[PDB]
């Protein structure tokens, strides 16, 4: 009969709850860089959750902060996929 | 440089 009014949302967060998100002053945010690269390469192949899981790995393994302020230097980031979706999502 | 959001 009915569905929850909260169903069928997906929140792709750039960072874990509580944490800072990192951005490169010339190349853009780690997360959006990686999301656009993964979509370009896999959006005609992979389901959305699996593209977003590859975004997680790219950000987690390839990015580390460079800061002239030591407090902000050599930091890491894991994005945070939050799915109230009820079906798989394919972009083609 | 890396900066925070």
């Amino acid at each position: 009969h009915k569905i929850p009014v909260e169903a069928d949302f997906l929140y792709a967060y750039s960072t874990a709850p509580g944490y800072y998100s990192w951005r490169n002053s010339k190349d853009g945010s780690w997360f959006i860089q990686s999301l656009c690269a993964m979509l370009k390469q896999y959006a005609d192949k992979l389901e959305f959750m699996h593209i977003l899981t590859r975004v997680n790995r790219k950000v987690a393994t390839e990015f580390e902060s460079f800061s002239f302020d030591a407090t902000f230097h050599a930091k890491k980031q894991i994005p945070c996929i939050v799915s109230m979706l009820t079906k798989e999502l394919y972009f083609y | 440089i890396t900066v925070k959001d």
């Binding site: 569905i3 929850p4 009014v5 909260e6 169903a7 069928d8 949302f9 997906l10 929140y11 792709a12 967060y13 750039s14 960072t15 874990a16 709850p17 509580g18 944490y19 800072y20 998100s21 951005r23 490169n24 002053s25 010339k26 190349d27 853009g28 945010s29 997360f31 959006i32 860089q33 999301l35 656009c36 979509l39 370009k40 959006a43 959305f48 580390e64 407090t71 902000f72 050599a74 930091k75 890491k76 980031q77 894991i78 979706l85 079906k87 798989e88 999502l89 394919y90 972009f91 083609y92 | 900066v3 925070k4 959001d5």
Partner: protein, 139 residues
């Protein structure tokens, strides 16, 4: 099974790109976000979304835009995508002039409030901080 993605259009992709904040907020400008917004524009153009880019919105213009779009008729659209590039904290995204709660934005699209998107995937991509914890990593 899987969302029906063969409606006449893929849907809207709304990109809110806040670079320059009012100095009364004490918020630095987000240099590089223009590269992000343009990357997102091209990416979603290639997936067939009608991309609408917005720049430097106050929290009231964010709420008003989100309301207006949620009252558009999406009957012929498969999905909805919203990208928020800004400063933030947990639960909160910043317009140019102050914070606005994320749940205020997403609520306009609840299944009971946006009938022409009921049963269709609503994607929120959020580039923003969620607090002040630091992940020092492990080798």
């Amino acid at each position: 099974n899987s969302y029906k993605m063969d409606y006449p259009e893929m849907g809207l992709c709304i990109i809110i790109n806040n670079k320059n904040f009012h100095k009364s907020t004490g918020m630095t400008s987000r240099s590089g976000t223009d590269v992000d917004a343009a990357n997102l524009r091209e990416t979603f153009r290639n997936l067939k979304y009608e991309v609408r880019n917005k720049n430097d919105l106050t929290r009231e213009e964010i709420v008003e835009l989100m309301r207006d779009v949620s009252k558009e008729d999406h009957s012929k659209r498969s999905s909805f995508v919203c990208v928020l590039l800004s400063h933030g904290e947990e639960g909160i995204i910043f317009g140019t002039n102050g914070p606005v709660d994320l749940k205020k934005i997403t609520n306009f699209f609840r299944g009971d409030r946006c009938r022409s998107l009921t049963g269709k995937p609503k994607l929120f991509i959020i580039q923003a901080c969620r607090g002040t914890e630091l992940d020092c990593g492990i080798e």
